[PDB]
Amino acid sequence: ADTIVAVELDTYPNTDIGDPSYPHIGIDIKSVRSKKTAKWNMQNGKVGTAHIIYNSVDKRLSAVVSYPNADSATVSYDVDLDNVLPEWVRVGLSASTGLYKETNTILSWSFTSKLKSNSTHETNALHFMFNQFSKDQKDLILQGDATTGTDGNLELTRVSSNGSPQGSSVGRALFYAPVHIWESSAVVASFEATFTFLIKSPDSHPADGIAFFISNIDSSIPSGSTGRLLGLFPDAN
Amino acid sequence: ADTIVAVELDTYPNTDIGDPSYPHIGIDIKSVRSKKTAKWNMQNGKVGTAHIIYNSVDKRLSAVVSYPNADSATVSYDVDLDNVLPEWVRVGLSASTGLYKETNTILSWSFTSKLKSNSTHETNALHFMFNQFSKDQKDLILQGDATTGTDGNLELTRVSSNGSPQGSSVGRALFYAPVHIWESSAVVASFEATFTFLIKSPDSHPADGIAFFISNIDSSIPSGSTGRLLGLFPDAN
Ligand SMILES: [N-]=[N+]=NCc1cc(C(=O)NCCCO[C@H]2O[C@H](CO)[C@@H](O)[C@H](O)[C@@H]2O)cc(C(=O)NCCCO[C@H]2O[C@H](CO)[C@@H](O)[C@H](O)[C@@H]2O)c1
Ligand SMILES: [Ca+2]
Ligand SMILES: [Ca+2]
Ligand SMILES: [Mn+2]
Ligand SMILES: [Mn+2]
């Protein structure tokens, strides 16, 4: 059982497991049943941007998702990640499809993490920024159907030669190095993540969504976690 | 209207037309509604083996399907093929997908048929064995989406470049030469069929199955027989 904290861009309402009856962004703490959600006007075919922020002083996890010339969706939740996640973790992106599908394209991804301790200017930091993915992206752990190189983008789920999405696909991309997300002696700990995506669906029923997540270092795709589970959870508990 | 006798490896339960509520192997005499069925623990992603046997003395059609280190499923039915099939027929393999899908890969296929008459030691026989299929398999009649050559296997249904199965696909492969399956003057008539298959599905809902069948010589894929009809029957009567 991995420990998962995630911000989900959920495109398909699975009402039987808690989803609001419309596309939404949500904050998931160890469960696919978002602790908090917000309505999201997902725009089929357009490039969007997501910003996730957190700092140990406020203990507030917030996410903003927007499209150019459009309103943005915000969701924020009070949580002390010290009581939830192990000290070291891996961060990544996840996406899936089920009966319904969509392309889950990542055009760019950046992450920053900082630990400031009880010392004179003694800050530890990690920062990576990808604006172009390559055929052999060695600093990324690709899991499931995830692939890179196609137009310099990261395709989290299966796409056919003619560019059409496929169902029952699940894929993840985790940054290669473990991240020191919190530490008992830290005065302030914080991280920020940003990624631009392109979700396109041939019909009017896209599924299932993309997610930014933080997990235990050795995390892997749970069995049968395609569709509603976003490639993150073993079940809907 | 073709005459069809078949042993089906049904992976998807279509309860509204008779299927038990689980994967099963069954004997179909002129109807998709199996005269007899048996529970089958289909193992996703593994190579299985099917053996079909029949002799005119017992007038018993039996089938055994198994996987290495696993139990096998058996189904047997009393039928006098003389009253059902014409004297000459074609034998083959059929498979399909509907809304749900699976790869329907044949790795090998062999068939033996014998007619022993009231003539001291005068036996007629036909035997063919395929352990490798080639790009141009001239002794096979391919119908629907069926293709050969891909890794030396026979793909009964459509598979995309990246190896993922597709829906609404139907394909058949019939041995080129007509088979003399029975004859009024025969003391004993018998046939045996064996094939190994690989059914793989990306999710947990595989469909629709593979079938070994015997039909009239000029048989072709019934219109709209994808999905539940296994590319064998025009309807669910
Ligand atoms: N598209 N569409 N359509 C209608 C439809 C809708 C739903 C549906 O909207 N479900 C919602 C939850 C999806 O839930 C799934 O998708 C969502 C969204 O991605 C995910 O979030 C979930 O986690 C899950 O993956 C289910 C079924 C269905 O089960 N049909 C069964 C008979 C199919 O009968 C057909 O297929 C059979 C087998 O191949 C054949 O035997 C038969 O002849 C015929 O061809 C059918
Ligand atoms: Ca959902
Ligand atoms: Ca069925
Ligand atoms: Mn949701
Ligand atoms: Mn059946």
UniProtKB/Swiss-Prot annotation, chains A, B:
Concanavalin A-like lectins of the Diocleinae subtribe undergo proteolytic processing referred to as circular permutation. The propeptide is split into an N-terminal and a C-terminal part, the gamma and beta chain, respectively. These are then religated in beta-gamma order to form the mature alpha chain. The beta and gamma chains can often be detected in cell extracts. Residues 1-118 of the mature chain, as displayed here, probably constitute the beta chain in the propeptide, residues 119-237 the gamma chain. Pfam families: Lectin_legB. Mn(2+) binds at E8, D10, D19, H24. This is Concanavalin-A. PANTHER family: CONCANAVALIN A-LIKE LECTIN FAMILY PROTEIN, LEGUME LECTIN DOMAIN-CONTAINING PROTEIN. It comes from Canavalia cathartica (Jackbean). GO terms for molecular function: D-mannose binding; metal ion binding. A carbohydrate binds at N14, G98, L99, Y100, D208, R228. It comes from the Eukaryota. SUPFAM superfamilies: Concanavalin A-like lectins/glucanases (SSF49899). Belongs to the leguminous lectin family. The lineage of its organism: Eukaryota, Viridiplantae, Streptophyta, Embryophyta, Tracheophyta. Binds one manganese (or another transition metal) ion and one calcium ion. The metal ions are essential for the saccharide-binding and cell-agglutinating activities. Ca(2+) binds at D10, Y12, N14, D19. Glucose/D-mannose specific lectin. Keywords: Calcium, Lectin, Manganese, Mannose-binding, Metal-binding. Homotetramer.
